Structures are given as C-alpha cells and as structure tokens.
C-alpha cells in the first residue's frame, strides 16, 4: 500500500500462476519464502565425511599439499556415518523437535546438516553455522573411536583446515554457500559474496531458477546494504520482478521471440516496442530521422530494460552454448539501448561499467577467471546494484562445456549437499507461491 | 669433556665461569667498546650534517657500567658485540627475510591441462624448456609482445628467476638443467625418494622476484608479480591470442587455484597481505631451512639450526619491527643461536632419551612428557647455577626460559616422535621453571605459556591445531618474543630424529634446495656471522642508478 | 530499428554497420582455405578439434530457455571457441573498434565481443567463427592498408602510415606489392610464415575511405559539428547523472 | 605561441609534426637504443655469473621496429628513454615512496593532559625541548633506559628523526627552531594564517622512521614504530617509572586516538595495513606534494604536479607492482607527466573559463560542467588530429582519454570552484571521446566511467563521497590505470583556483613543508628527472655494512 | 536513539543494517527538509558516514 504497482507473476514454463500481485509483495521485507531462503542459506553447510577420513590416513591436513610424516590415523567414519551423524546432531540441536536436520548422503560419504533456527536467533551473524556443524563432528569422531588426547587435534586439522592460524578455514572438509564475515568488500555484502557457480550447482543448471536465486540474493542484500531504502526502494523492487522473477512473462516472451534466429540487437528492438506499446516510454523530441524517447516513470524503464538484458543473455550465450560473452552482452546491450533511444542503460550505466571491467577481468592476465568464478561481492562485479551477477548465473547454467573452472570443478559438495533443499534448487515456485499467499495483506 | 659453552664464556670474561664474583663501573661506559665507538662519532657527524640532534651517549643512562659482551655465533668460530647482529646492521639477515618474501610456489599442472583441453595444443619438455626460457626473460621485468615497451634494467634484477622440480626422473632429466632443482643431486637417497613419491609426476614452479620490487613494495606484491609474468610467458611461448577469454585462465591458476604462498594474510588489528612473517606457520619455517638434507645424522643439528631461522626472523624482524620497533629485540633472539648454550642443553636431552628409550621409542603420552621435560629443564637450570658468567649472559629471565624450554621440547619430541607431546613439554618446563627460581620472563611472557597446558590438545574452533600447523597468528602466541622460533625447532624435532624428509609441506623443503638463492639456507647460523662481520652481499642496492 | 543519431556520413556509416539488412559492400574474394590459414587455429583439412561433446550425446537438464534457443552449429558439434581480431587506423580505416562490437551483437548470434583503442575481438564455436570471418575479411569491415589481421603485437592504430600509405605491422604480416598495387597476407594472425601468402586486392583510395569511414575527425567530419550526435551523448549524460542522485 | 608540447615532438621525430607519413623497420630494432644496448650486455652478463639466462632481446617479439621514443619531463629541459621512468630503474621515485610510507602525524594534546593531569606535572616549551632531543636520540633505534642495549648504526639510519608544528606563533618560538617546521617561513602570508587558524593551540609531531627498516618491513611499521620510541622518551624525558600504568595512555594515544595515518588499511582481497599506496585519499596526496606553497600564482602548475605525484604512486608503483607486476605501468603515467602534453590542454582550459567566468566565478551546476568540459575535451582531440606525431607520441587510448579527462575536469573545477562538478566534467570528457574517435581505452578502462556520472552526484553508502575523500579503494576505482593520480589533480584544482592552502587536510599540507626530507615535494617533475639521469641520492643503502 | 525493525534483520545475514539503513535515511531526511541540491548532497552523506567507502 506504499506503491500502487501490481505484477502478473508466472511459472518457469511460461504460465500464468498469480495475477495482479501487489509488487510489494515480492519485497525481501515481506516475502515469507525470501526470508525462508536467507535463513537457510545461512544455516546450512555440507560435511565431506570421505575427505576427513582420507585426510587423517594420509596426513594430509592444513592446505595444498601438506602433510605431516608419522601422524597418520586410520579410522572406519564412512563405515561408521549413521552412528557418528546422529552423535553431531545430538549437540547441534537446541531441542529434539527443533528445526535442526542431519542427513546422510551417498552412502554415508557426506552430509547436508541445518542447524537450528534458535542458535541464529540470539547470534549477530552466521558463523555458527560452520563452527557448530564442525564442532559436533570432530567430537562424535573422537568419541566413536575413542580417540586419545594426543591424537585427536588431528581430527580437528582434519575438519576445520589450518584455521586459526589462517583466518580461513584452510583445508577443510565442510563448506558452506556463504564466505567469512572478514571477507566482505563492505558492511551489508554477506548475501553477495556466493559464488556464481555455487548457484548454478544447487539450481542444476535450470536457467530460469539460476537467475531466480541469483537475484533474490543478490536484491535481498541491496535492503541489507540501505541501497533499496527511501528514494531507490520501488526501483529495487520493479528490478527484483522484472528482470529475476519473469514478472508479465516479459523475460520468457522475449527469449521465445528471439531465440531460433535472434541476436542481442533484436532483443533490444522488441523490448523498445514493448515498450512503447505498454505506455512506459514516448516520443518527447523529434530530431533529424531520429526520436528522442521520454519517460515519466524511470524506474519501470529501467525494470522493462532489465528483463531485456536477462533475455539478451539467454539469446546470446544460449546459441553459443558457452557462457564467456556475458560480459559482452553486458556491455553492448546498454551501449546500444542508449543510442536507440536517449534514455539512460540499466542502473543508470551501472550494468555497463561492470561489463567492462568483468569483460577485461576474463580476458586478461591481471586477475578474475571464468564467469563461475565471480560474484557480487567481488570487487570486479560488485559495481551494480543487483542487476549484472543474475545474468552472469543464466550464462553459466546455459553452458555446455567450454569451461575449466566449471561448477563441476570448484562447487562439487555444494551441488551435492545444497540441491537436496527444495528452496534452493526451485525458488521461483516459492517465492511466487507466498506472494500469492500474502497478497492481501499489503 | 667441557660444556659446550664454556668456550664462549671464557671470551667473554676475565674470571673463570665459575667465579661468582666481578668488578664494575671502571670499564669507562660506552669507551669499552669498538661499536659504541663508532656510534658515538657516526651520531656526531649524522647531526652536524642534517641539522638535528641525533645518537648521543648522554641522553638517558649510561651503558657500559658491566662488560659489554661479544657473542659467539653457534656453530662457528666468529665472535661479535651484539649490535652486529641486529636486522638493521646486518644485511645476511635482511637478505634471509627478502628470499622468503620473494618467492612462491606455482604449479603448472592446471596451466598445462588449459593448454591440453581449451586450446587443444601440445605440451612436451621441449615446450616446457622454451616456456622457461622466455619466463626467464619476463619474470625480472622485459617485455615479450608489445611494441614501444620500457623494461627494468637486468642488473638491477640479476637475483630474480624461474626454475623447476618434478618427481618423474626421465621428465625432469629432458628439461635443460639451468631450469631444474635436481632433486637427487640435493637431497641424500631416502629424502629423496619420499620427496619424488610426494610430488609424483606434478611439475612446479618456485618463481622468486626481484629483492629491489619486493623491498620498495610488499609481500603481498609477489604471486601477483609472479602471476603476471607467468601469464606473459604462457601468451609468447604457446601462441594464445594476446588476451583471450583461456587467458583468464591461466591468472586465476597462477593467483589462487595451484599457487603455495610462503604467509597467509592477518586480520585487521594486525592488518597484512600474503607473504609476510606472521602469516608463515611454524612447519613451513622448519621446511625452508635446509639443515635437514645435509645434516642429517645429526637431529639437534638440525632442529637447533631451525631455532636459529626462526628466532631471528619472529623476533628480530616480525615482533621487533613490523609489530613494534624501535631498538627492537635482538638478545631475546641471539639467545637461541649463540654461545653454544642452546646446543649444549639439547645434546644433554638428545644423550638423555638415546640412552633411556632410544630415538623415537619412548610411548607418545604424558608419562614421556613428564619424564623428559622434567629432566632437560633441571639440568639447563643447574647450568646457570653452576656457572655465574653462564647467568650474566643470558641476564633476561624469557631469554632463559625460551632456552630451557626449547631444549626440554625439542628433546621430548625426539623422544615420542610426535611434535605435540613436544609442546606440552615446553609448557611444563615454564612452570617448573617459574616455581624454581619464582620468576619467569618480563610482565608479559607466560600469556601463551598459562594458556598453554590446557590449548595444547583441544580440539575447539580456535584453540585446537597440531603445532607444525600453528605459527605466529595463532591466537595465544600473536604478541611475545622467545616463542615462536623456538616452537618451530620443536616442529623439526620429532621429524629430525625420524629422518623425514619434510615437516609439513614437500614443496616448500625442495623449493628452498637451491643453490641460486641469496642467503644460504644449509647454514643459517653460518650466513648470521658472515653478515656480522660485515661480509655477505646482498640483492636489491641502487648503487647502480645512483652517483659515485 | 535507429541505432545511431546523427547527420554526417559518419553517423550513417555507423547505422549501416549496425543495420543486418544493410547489405555490406564486398570488396574483394578470399578461397574457404585461405580464411582457415589466416586464422590460424587449424591446418586446411584437419578435422575440428572439440571441446566437450556433441550436444545431442548428452543428457541436458529440462529447461525452456534451452529449448527456445537454437545453438549454432558449432555449438552443436562442440567445437572449441576460437578468435578473429582487427586493428583499425585512426587515418580513416572503415569500420573502428566500437562499431565493430555494436555491429557484431546486432548481426552475429553467439558472440563474445571486445573493444580496445588498438584491437577488437570476436569469440566463438570455430565453424562458425570461419563463416563470421569470411564476411569480415571480403567486406567494407576491412581495407588492406587501414586495417590488418592481427591476433597479438597490435601496435599501429595512432602511428603515422608508411610511404605507401600502409599501418605499422611490427611482424609485417601484410605486404603491399608495389607492382600491383595490391596487398598479400603473407602470414597467419599470429605471425606464422604462409606457405603461400593471400591475395587481399587493392587498398581504397582517399576518397573513398573518407565515403566509408566512421571515425570522426577535424579533416574529415568532426564529431563537434555533428550537433544532433552530440546532443544525445550530452543527453544521457545528464539523466544518468541525475538518475544516480533521485528517481 | 607554440603549443607547449612542439619542442618535445620535434626532438623525437625527423619529421615535422603535422606530417602523415613516416618510415619504419630499418633502425636496427633495440641497437637504435643506447639503454636497450646497456641491459642487453647487462642480461648476458648477469646469465653468466648466476648461469641461468635471463633477459635477451631475441625472446619474443623485436622492440624498436618504430623509434624508440625519448620523452621530455614535464616543466623540465631533461630528455630520457622511458626506461629511466620505471619505478625500479628510478631512485627518486623509489625514495619518493619511501617518504610517504614511512612517515606519520602524532599529535602530544592528549599526551600532554596525561601528563599534568594523571603523573601531575608541568608541561612547558622546555620541557617539550628536551622531550624533542631525547626521541631523535630514541626514534632512529637507541636506548635511553636498559643496560646492555643493542644498537642500530646511526649513519645506517641518519633520515629517522622528529619534529613538531603548532599554530600559536608565540609558542613555537620558545621550542628549540632545529625540531620546529615553521609555518610563517614554509608557507606565503594568507596561506600561513589559514594553517595556523586551523591548528590553532594544538601542537603535532611529524614522526619519519628509517627508509632501510620501511624496506626491510612494510606501512603499517612506521605508527608502530614511532610509538614505541615516543614511549621511551616519554618515560626518559618526565620521569614516569620505566612501565607504569599511565604508560598505556602514551601508547593508546600514539597509536590510536591522535594518530594520523598517510593510509588506511584495505580490505581482504587486497589486504594490506597501513600506510600503503591504496589507502592514500586523494585529497591527501594533494596536499602531501607541496607544489601549493610555492607556485599559488599559477593553479595549473599546481594542479599538474599534484598529477604527477599521483600517476607516479598510483599508477606506477601501487597499481604496476603492489597490484600487479612485471614491466608493469610506466608510459600509462607518463603520459600525463611528460611532453608539455597535459600542460597545453589544461593552461587552454584555464584561459577559456578565465575568459568566460573568471575564476570560480562560474555557477556550480550541469550548464557549467555541459560548457566547460565539452570545449576543452574538443581541444584535446583536435591536436591529436592536427599532430600525427602526437597520435603517435600518446600512442595508447588510455594515456590520451586520461590526459584530456583530467584537462576537462581540472578546467571545469576551476569555473565552478568545486571538485564534485569537476568530477562530472571528467566523465562527460570520457563519453564524447567515446563517441568521437570510436575508441577510448584499454578493454577495462572505462568501468568507473561508465559508472561514472550517476556516482558522482549519488548519496548512497558506497556510492556518495565528495572527490576529496575517494581515493584507490573507492569500489569503482580499485583496479585501473589513468585515473587516480588525474582524480588527486582535479581534488586540487578548485582549491587552486580559490587560493586555499589545503585540499583536504591542514595538518598532511604541513607535514611535508620539511627541508629534511630526503625527496623534494615543492618539485616533483623535477626530482623525477634527476632520478632518471641517476642522479638521486636515496636513503636506505647497506654500503657501509658490506663488501667494499 | 533509532531501533530499526526487526524485520529488516529477520532476512539480513548480519547487523549492518542498523548503521547503513539509518545513515540512509537521515541523509535523504536531511536533504528533503531543506531542498539541498544535487551539487551538494554528497556533502550530508560525508557528515553522516564519514569517509566511507574509501576506508
Ligand atoms: C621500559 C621497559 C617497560 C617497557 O614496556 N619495555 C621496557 C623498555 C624496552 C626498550 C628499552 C630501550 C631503551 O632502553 O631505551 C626495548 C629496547 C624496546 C624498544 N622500544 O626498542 C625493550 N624494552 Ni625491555 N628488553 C629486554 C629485556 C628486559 C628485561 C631486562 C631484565 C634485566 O635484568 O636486565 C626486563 C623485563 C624482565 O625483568 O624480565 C625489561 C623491562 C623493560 N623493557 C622496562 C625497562 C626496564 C628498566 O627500567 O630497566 N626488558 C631482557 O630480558 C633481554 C632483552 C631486552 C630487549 C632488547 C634486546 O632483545 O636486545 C629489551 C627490549
Ligand atoms: C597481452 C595483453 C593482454 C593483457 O592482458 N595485457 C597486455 C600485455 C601487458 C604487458 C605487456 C608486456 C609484454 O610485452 O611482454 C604489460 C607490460 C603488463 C605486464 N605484464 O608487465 C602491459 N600490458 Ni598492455 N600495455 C600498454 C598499452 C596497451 C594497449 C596498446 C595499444 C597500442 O596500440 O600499442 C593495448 C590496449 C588498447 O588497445 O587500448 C594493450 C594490450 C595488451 N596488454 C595485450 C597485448 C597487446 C598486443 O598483443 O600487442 N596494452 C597502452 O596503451 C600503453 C601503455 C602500455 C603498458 C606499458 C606501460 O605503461 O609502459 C602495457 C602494460
Ligand atoms: C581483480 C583482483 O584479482 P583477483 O580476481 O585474482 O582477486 C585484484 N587485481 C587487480 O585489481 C589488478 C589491478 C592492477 C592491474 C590492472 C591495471 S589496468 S592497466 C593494464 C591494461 S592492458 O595494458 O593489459 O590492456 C587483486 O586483488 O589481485
Ligand atoms: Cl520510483
Ligand atoms: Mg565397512
Ligand atoms: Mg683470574
Ligand atoms: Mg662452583
Ligand atoms: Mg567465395
Ligand atoms: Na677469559
Ligand atoms: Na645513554
Ligand atoms: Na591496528
Ligand atoms: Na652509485
Ligand atoms: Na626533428
Ligand atoms: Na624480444
Ligand atoms: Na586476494
Ligand atoms: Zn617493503
């Protein structure tokens, strides 16, 4: 009731789901599976209990080839999983009918765990989670085999890395979607420092899902941050609709125009005509061969040239099959709308300085990787406020191959452990489900 | 027959050791001494030149009311007054600080899989030697693509290379062998197998910088450095576009996915990149010292040539500079590298478990611990006891108790064969030192040592590690001096008497067996006197660019 | 679509670059195999290497974004990403470096492209790439003295021409025939010796190149007198710059 | 008459300026260059001794297929090969960094109220004298309390020293004038009374510790450093006991609550702690060079060399090794230090507003910024249009789009007499240019730009800061070359044209106004130029400790 | 004294909400209670946050 805007909300096949949604509704503020995603994510971890016993039979603690000579601890854990899992969550748990979950997974070699919405409740971050997970495991070890004092700081190593002699936890055998609170670029950044891939790996490459969760992050940590407070609020929110939960079928309508032939200029071409058609841009100035577009409402032109970029990127690396021109489209998708039109690009240049940068940053000696390896706590892509990381996971999840550093290759456990929560792998459905569901309380 | 040290105090003092009584205050304070000397009339001349008081012997109290003693560096023949082997003073020590700084461990096994799969091109020795030859050229700062590019003058430079090691033989036998670490040339048979079998067919990288770039920057500088040029060389030598979307592959590999930093970074409070002291943990410190692979029938020879890296490096320049300064702590160190004290204390222990238990074959429990530890701390303080001049040399109580200790662990360590038991030893010799003479060290040395029985085998968040993975931002031990290189002699002790080959990381003990290095790591306590009597040349000068 | 505001030549030859249905003037014939060693990523008759496999021998996750669009061919073969890259003089050269990224993304699908003063790229499936390049090698994109083929040592873009009016090649890969008048390609993008070099016919001449070109500059048309041009590159300026201060 | 860069372009080329045509290839590649030549017989020299080649002209592609180019520097009649401007080949722009890293601001107010108001005793001009000449006895690394100290040599450390700076006149007349930087005789009437009105009665030390230990260490030493041995002269000078508790307020104060850092320490991708390039702001670095108190006739030659100091550290040190590495960044900065080049385009634009508006006459809003920069930007680019030779001077994009920006935004800062609207005059520089010659820069260059004009004016969290306040870690700007040392001048253009002594902090401005530093901030470009032609004389050497 | 809700924190990772999403709002206050322009603004967010994002 702060805004009048309603949204037409619809399925990741294209169907109509819930109509005349109060945009507000789809707020992080609001949205009940939004905030049952945060608090997941910040709960969860994955236990590689195979790594930890390889670890201790070899030695091999601490990092990259390291190891310590005569150390050696030869214990049967996977053997031994269900009876050491239910000892971790014996101390993990707050109560027995909590929300705390333990569960098994490839015959014993790992486990997803949650720990319990009560322990974050009365903490200031979301440290606990790994540091309650590790605690649990590396007691319940220790007490299966009785392992004595002087051995069982191996276990330890063997858990939790070099950690507290580096700040990381450095050769660990858990992990967790989410970084340390000391490696954020700025206050507010813990819900953008999650590796595109680690996206990619828990939706399992389904595009649309992959650029749902990537924007719900990364626009739940723009209200984090106090960049959707105030004055930006309504443009973060149209932003969120638009362009990560295919609000009016906008996305998926222009991606099936575009598709069998089409190329990022043919895009813009529609997404101007739609415009136009809907009322949200006009002609203000005529020159020589040449109109100059208008807008009274900037924030839904920015929203409507949003969901053209996503699509942009769904065109373009889609017919490649191969997710490296993403900067590019980045780019060139705003370099273009601008001198299409007279109006500002997404994020009022925003988009397009990212794309810049993260096109040099993939190409070049000095840094940065592949497309996987980004996201928008790093400092190449932290630059827009929400609207440049989601189309770098649709490009990724399009991707057929052509990249070393793949979701394969670094974020293995986390497609293991995190595409068992039905929040994570399919959030559209859910989020559309409890907009639907609160729609007359706005 | 004699103690070890009893050469030493015999230099020092007119009286026999035994004497418990001197004279002082007629010595004519500073006068006494050659380097005061010299201090006195460098300060004189500094002021008059630059306009501002400076050194002046009358400012505060007057040294030199006892004898200012000279300090014979273990191991050797060279006896110096103290001031020599302060950091500032002597270059063999700055020099040990900037080969660590500058170097870092780069794999090629990810670079060469790029090459393989992305690209689809070939990698042999023959293209392995070539892309050697063109780091070679790049990595000291010349150019390799473009045109009209300005590059650093290679004299300036001459310290900085590329070599490599591989545990394949036959492979590391076709690549030209002014690129290779020869592992069997520089390690004895046994040492070598392990290593061989440790690194198996991966073929690395050990990349040093220039000492110049890494003096005028930081630590931090150097994987960056490295990566850059790394990235040059893959470009020239295997025909990439210059700047493609696999480029970007080869960066992340060099800078994050197959690269060994000597450091980790610290937090805030104590704010540093990679590369820097006190993010080296105490088993790569014993691995970069290369004692281990000449002297190994001897492990206090080796353990005590760790101490001697270590003590020197924590405390001298990390602790005594980097987190604090000034005059800075330099017998808080030397305690542990001279006068063959440390070395007498430890050949006691090592006689002690031979003869009791045998290397090695004593039960890793508290029984062994209590044994030994016990033992080795009442003799070293018996020596002080026994020999007034032994207890005016070592005058600070922390001096005393890192020596004690460190004796007292590193011996129980040779006998258990496992480093923690070692550490717990360590900490009971504090506390029955403590309650022997009823004091310990200055206000604040036994923060880590009270902590200490109780950290040593938890397993808790940060609390609980195997001692060759702590090091100096280890939460107890981030503060004090006569620790830290101490506890990494403790980390070689048990692996010393073994006959391991490594501490802690196999790359890091070969990447330091090379002969093209600076300073000299086979003989630390060695370079430390060559650097006192003013005589070992170091990289990174500008006499080149300046006036005569 | 309008692409570009303006009422210079220059601004037109920017339209007509973007425009898919402008027909590109061909200038010159180059043979299937003289495209594939002027690349220079594989030998004339040497099957193409892949990267992973073909798409239909594996198992793709069930997704209506990648059933709405087609891969191109190479996609489809698994072919590894490969490269063509210009530079373009600022002494009237044709196309220049951001009008070949604009230009790229309106007309070819699939591709990565990147712009830089002295070099601009394109990446993608090698089939495909070896189609792309033909028309970027025969057409008004290229002139054989203003623009040259290069995949590494780019440097030439703002140097002054040689006596025949050529860009500086530190590896000379283009060679003008004073008998002829006409340019050879004599060795691969990256530098590599041909075994026989390639015809790329003649450079145009000055007045042709100041018809064609689409860089501004005071002896040709300045940008400064293009006032429409300017209006609308001032125009997004201020919007952006208020944009970021409120809504 | 002349554009000011003619003279420069005449020397390089035989051509004239405007001439199309040119000849390559037939030079002989690098034997054209009298430095090629050196660092080839350097390289084979250097692969020799050490028996590992190293730099050899043959690896990769041929340098010198064009003229190899000599640049003149800036306000100079000096002409040198690029090389002698790297970083690593130039002593005057290592020891430029030097005296920044290792200098820090340290006020005695709230050490001064511990003294009289917890020890009880008298603080006087006296008492301040003799506490001055015991810590420049202290602060270059010598004891004033503990027998059988241990040393650093004075002349090893003759640039550490100690001064102070207070805005009431009377009172720093009664301190001893050798340990006084003197406001009314640094600094020209109006300026002074501006800085002393500022300081007021507060009194503030300027603390540098020794160039051989910020080399051997890193930044975040030198406020450690310096509290350490503020401590100890404290504690000589007043009589406290030697560690008491009212110790702990000297050190919480010096280094902590009236300390001013040069840098802030970043975060931990590129962890470094203090004192390091990427936390200087850029209102700090203009006031670090001291071109402001000599020149304030003339606000562009201000404002250029307040660029020079910039480009230099930013791009040449922090961004080419701290950041990066290898042959690294030199004709990136040059290009706006170097050829008269920047100077032409920006005396132009200072003309034309002085013309049109009179000096900070100019209505501070877009209608200025819209006039200004567009005029001046269309100058920049007709010359390299009108000079083929100058094309081909600034031979990359990014050296020419920084060199016009900073003309455009410099010339709209001094119109309106604001930096922010100076800021958007740069970005509005960068989108013509765009557009104009269809290019701009390098692949990354124009992230910020493009973010550019909605973050000048925007008021969110890490969005909105004035310019005097962003420096290399402002998000847009951590990366890339051609912008930061351009962002320092346009901070220091508006405050040029409006005569104010200081851009964003009175008490840095003062702290450089000291003829005992070894670099000289008045002259930049000049200093420059000295350590190009190898004669600057740095700080820092260990001759006296080595072989002759 | 300002408590910002606790739905705020109830979908954040951590607690910088309560600094960022109050400095926010009293700098838009500010600036709306006395028109302060464009060309000023940035001054009301320095007096409120300090130099941040710098340091
Ligand atoms: C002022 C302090 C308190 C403070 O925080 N640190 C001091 C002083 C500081 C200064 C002394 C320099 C000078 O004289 O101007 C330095 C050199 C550190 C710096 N700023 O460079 C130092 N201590 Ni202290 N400090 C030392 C030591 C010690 C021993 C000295 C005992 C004695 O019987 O002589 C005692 C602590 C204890 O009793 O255990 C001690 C105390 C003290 N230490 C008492 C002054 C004691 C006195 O009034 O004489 N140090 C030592 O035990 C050996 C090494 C020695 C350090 C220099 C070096 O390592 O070469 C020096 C290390
Ligand atoms: C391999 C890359 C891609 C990579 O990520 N960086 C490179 C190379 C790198 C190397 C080149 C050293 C070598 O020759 O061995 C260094 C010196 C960085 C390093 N490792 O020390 C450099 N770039 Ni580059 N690089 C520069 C430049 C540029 C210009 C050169 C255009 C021209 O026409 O020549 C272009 C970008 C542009 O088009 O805008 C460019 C590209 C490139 N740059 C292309 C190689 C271009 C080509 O194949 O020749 N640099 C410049 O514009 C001037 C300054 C110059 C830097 C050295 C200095 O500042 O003195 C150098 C800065
Ligand atoms: C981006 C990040 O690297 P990372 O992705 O490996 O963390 C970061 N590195 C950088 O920001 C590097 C900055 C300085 C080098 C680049 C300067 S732009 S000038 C060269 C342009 S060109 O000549 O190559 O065209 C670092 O923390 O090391
Ligand atoms: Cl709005
Ligand atoms: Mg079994
Ligand atoms: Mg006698
Ligand atoms: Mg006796
Ligand atoms: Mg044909
Ligand atoms: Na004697
Ligand atoms: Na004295
Ligand atoms: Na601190
Ligand atoms: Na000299
Ligand atoms: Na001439
Ligand atoms: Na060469
Ligand atoms: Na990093
Ligand atoms: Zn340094």
Avoid at chain 2, 154 to 166: G, R
Wanted: charged share 25%; aromatic share 8%; glycine share 8%.
């Amino acid at each position: 009731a702060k805004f009048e805007d309603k949204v037409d909300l619809y399925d990741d096949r294209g169907n109509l789901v819930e109509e005349q949604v109060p945009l507000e509704a789809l707020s992080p503020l609001r949205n009940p599976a939004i905030k049952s995603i945060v608090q997941g994510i910040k709960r969860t971890v994955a236990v590689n209990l195979e790594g930890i016993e390889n670890a201790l039979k070899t030695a091999k603690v601490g990092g990259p080839a390291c190891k310590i000579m005569g150390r050696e601890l030869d214990l049967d854990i996977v053997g031994n999983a269900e009876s050491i899992a239910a000892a971790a969550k014996e101390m993990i748990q707050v109560t027995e009918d909590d929300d705390t979950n333990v569960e098994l997974l490839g015959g014993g070699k790992r486990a997803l765990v949650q720990v319990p919405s009560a322990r974050f409740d009365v903490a200031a971050e979301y440290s606990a989670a790994p540091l309650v997970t590790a605690t649990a495991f590396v007691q319940a070890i220790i007490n299966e085999f009785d392992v004595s004092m002087y051995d069982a700081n191996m276990v330890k190593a063997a858990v939790l890395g070099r950690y507290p002699q580096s700040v990381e936890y450095m050769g660990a055998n858990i992990a967790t979607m989410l970084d340390i609170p000391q490696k954020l670029e700025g206050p507010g950044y813990a819900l953008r420092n999650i590796m595109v891939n680690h996206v990619v790996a828990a939706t399992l490459k389904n595009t649309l899902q992959a650029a749902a969760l990537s924007t719900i992050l990364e626009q739940t940590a723009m209200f984090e941050m106090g960049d959707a407070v105030g004055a930006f609020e309504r443009m973060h929110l149209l932003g969120l609709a638009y362009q990560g939960m295919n609000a009016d079928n906008l996305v998926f309508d222009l991606v099936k125009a575009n598709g069998k032939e089409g190329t990022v200029g043919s895009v813009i071409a529609d997404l101007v005509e739609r415009a136009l058609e809907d009322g949200v841009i006009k002609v203000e100035k005529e020159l020589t061969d040449y109109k100059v577009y208008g807008t009274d409402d900037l924030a839904m032109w920015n929203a409507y040239a949003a969901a053209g970029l996503m699509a942009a990127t769904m065109v373009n690396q889609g017919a490649a099959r191969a997710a490296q021109g993403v900067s590019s489209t980045l780019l060139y998708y705003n370099d273009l709308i601008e001198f299409e039109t007279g109006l500002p690009s997404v994020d009022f240049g925003k988009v397009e300085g990212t794309a810049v940068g993260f096109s040099f940053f993939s190409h070049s000696i000095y840094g940065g990787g592949g497309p996987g390896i980004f996201n928008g706590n790093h400092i190449v892509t932290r630059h827009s406020k929400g609207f440049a990381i989601p189309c770098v996971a649709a490009a990724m999840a399009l991707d057929a191959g052509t990249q070393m550093f793949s979701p394969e290759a670094t974020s293995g456990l986390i497609k293991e452990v995190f595409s068992q929560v039905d929040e994570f792998r399919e959030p559209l459905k859910y989020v559309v489900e409890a907009a639907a569901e609160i729609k007359n309380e706005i | 027959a004699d103690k070890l040290f009893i050469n030493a105090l015999k230099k020092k003092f007119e009286e026999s050791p035994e004497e418990k009584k001197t004279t002082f205050y007629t010595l004519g304070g500073w006068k006494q001494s050659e380097r005061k000397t010299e201090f006195v009339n460098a300060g004189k001349e500094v002021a008059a030149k630059r306009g501002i008081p400076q050194y002046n012997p009358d400012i505060g109290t007057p040294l030199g009311q006892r004898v200012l003693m000279p300090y014979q560096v273990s191991t050797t023949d060279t006896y110096v007054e103290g001031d020599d082997l302060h950091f500032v003073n002597n270059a063999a020590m700055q020099q040990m600080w900037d080969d660590i700084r500058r170097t870092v461990i780069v794999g090629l096994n990810h670079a060469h899989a790029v090459i393989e799969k992305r690209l689809g091109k070939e990698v042999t020795p023959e293209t392995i030697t070539h892309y050697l030859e063109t780091v070679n050229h790049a990595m000291p700062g010349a150019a390799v693509v473009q045109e009209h590019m300005v590059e650093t003058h290679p004299a300036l430079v001459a310290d900085s290379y590329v070599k490599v090691f591989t545990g394949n033989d036959e492979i590391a036998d076709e690549i030209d062998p002014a690129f290779v670490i020869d592992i069997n040339k520089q390690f004895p048979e046994d040492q070598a197998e392990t290593l061989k079998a440790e690194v198996g067919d991966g073929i690395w990288q050990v990349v040093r910088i220039p000492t110049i770039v890494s003096r005028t920057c930081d630590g931090a500088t150097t994987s960056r450095w490295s990566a850059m040029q790394i990235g040059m060389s893959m470009i020239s030598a295997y025909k990439q576009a210059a700047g493609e979307a696999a480029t970007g592959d080869f960066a992340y590999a060099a800078k994050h996915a197959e690269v060994i930093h000597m450091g980790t970074y610290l937090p805030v409070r104590r704010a540093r990149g990679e590369n820097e002291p006190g993010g080296v943990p105490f088993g790569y410190l014993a691995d970069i010292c290369q004692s281990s692979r000449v002297n190994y029938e001897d492990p206090v020879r080796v353990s005590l040539d760790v101490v001697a890296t270590g003590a020197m490096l924590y405390d001298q320049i990390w602790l005594g500079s980097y987190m604090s300064g000034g005059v800075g702590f330099t017998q808080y160190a030397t305690a542990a590298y001279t006068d063959n004290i440390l070395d007498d204390f430890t050949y006691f222990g090592k006689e002690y478990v031979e003869d009791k238990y045998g290397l090695c074959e004593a039960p890793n429990n508290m029984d062994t611990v209590l044994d030994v530890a016990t033992e080795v701390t009442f003799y070293g303080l018996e020596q002080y006891e026994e020999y007034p001049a032994l207890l005016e040399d070592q005058f600070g109580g922390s001096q005393r108790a890192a020596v004690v200790a460190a004796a007292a662990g590193c011996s129980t360590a040779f006998a258990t064969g496992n480093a923690q038991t070692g550490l717990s030893g360590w900490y009971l010799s504090m506390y029955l030192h403590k309650e022997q003479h009823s004091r310990l060290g200055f206000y604040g040395y036994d923060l880590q040592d009270q902590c200490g029985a109780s950290n040593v085998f938890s397993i808790r968040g940060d609390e609980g590690l195997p001692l060759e993975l702590r090091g100096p931002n280890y939460p107890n031990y981030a503060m004090n001096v006569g620790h830290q290189g101490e506890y990494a002699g403790i980390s070689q002790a048990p692996h010393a008497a073994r006959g391991d080959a490594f501490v802690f990381n196999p790359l890091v003990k070969i990447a330091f067996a090379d002969d093209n290095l600076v300073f000299d790591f086979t003989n630390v306590r060695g370079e430390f006197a060559k650097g006192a009597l003013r005589e070992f040349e170091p990289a990174g000068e500008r006499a080149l660019i300046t006036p005569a | 679509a309008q692409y570009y505001p303006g009422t210079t030549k220059v601004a037109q030859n920017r339209r007509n670059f973007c425009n898919p249905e402008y027909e590109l003037e061909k200038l010159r014939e180059i043979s299937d195999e003289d495209v594939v060693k002027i690349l220079g990523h594989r030998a004339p008759g040497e099957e193409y290497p892949s990267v992973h496999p073909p798409l239909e021998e594996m198992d793709e996750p069930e997704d209506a974004i990648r059933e709405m669009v087609e891969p191109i061919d190479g996609a489809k073969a698994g072919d590894r990403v490969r490269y063509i890259q210009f530079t373009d003089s600022m002494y009237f050269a044709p196309a220049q470096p951001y009008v070949r990224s604009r230009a790229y993304l309106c007309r070819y699908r699939g591709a990565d492209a990147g712009t830089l003063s002295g070099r601009q790229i394109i990446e993608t499936r090698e089939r495909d790439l070896e189609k792309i390049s033909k028309e970027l090698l025969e057409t008004e994109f290229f002139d054989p003295a203003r623009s040259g083929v290069r995949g590494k040592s780019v440097h030439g873009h703002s140097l002054r021409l040689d006596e025949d009016g050529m860009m500086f090649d530190m590896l000379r890969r283009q060679i003008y025939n004073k008998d002829t008048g006409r340019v050879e390609m004599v060795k691969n993008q990256i530098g590599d010796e041909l075994d026989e070099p390639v015809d790329l016919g003649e450079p145009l001449d000055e007045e042709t190149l100041m018809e064609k070109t689409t860089i501004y500059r005071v002896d040709g048309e300045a940008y400064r007198d293009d006032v429409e041009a300017v209006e609308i590159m001032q125009r997004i300026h201020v919007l952006r710059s208020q944009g970021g201060f409120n809504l």
